[PDB]
Amino acid sequence: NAQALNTLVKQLSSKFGAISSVLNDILSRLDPPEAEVQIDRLITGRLQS
């Protein structure tokens, strides 16, 4: 039960195919429609975890 929680938390620092792994970091330095598809990759990856 300890390993599963540690693995779950460490999945928050994975790019999953986007520019970065921080929500507001890509929110600022990116085009608002361009940033829409980047958030999609992070959401789909974190749902699968």
Partner: protein
């Protein structure tokens, strides 16, 4: 176009990101351009800041630095294409 920002992209005509219509170009350079400049009607170059989508402002010359009207002429030509097209 939705999203992209800079100069008149959001200073005057802020197109919402949820746009659904279709953009059409009508170029008749000879008809809607004077030989020395369409000074009759002017564009707001340097206003205060941006504005929310579908917002119209008509007050002018009230703002001044802390410059007058920011209408920096047209200088159009009926034959010039780059920088002078009417592009309605």
């Amino acid at each position: 176009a939705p999203g992209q920002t800079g100069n008149i992209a959001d200073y005057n005509y802020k197109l919402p990101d949820d746009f659904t219509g279709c953009v059409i170009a009508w170029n008749s350079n000879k008809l809607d351009s004077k030989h020395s400049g369409n000074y009759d009607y002017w564009y707001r170059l340097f206003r205060k800041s941006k504005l929310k989508p579908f917002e119209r402002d008509i007050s002018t010359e009230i703002y001044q630095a802390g410059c007058y009207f920011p209408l920096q002429s047209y200088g159009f030509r009926p034959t010039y294409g780059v920088g002078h097209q009417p592009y309605r």
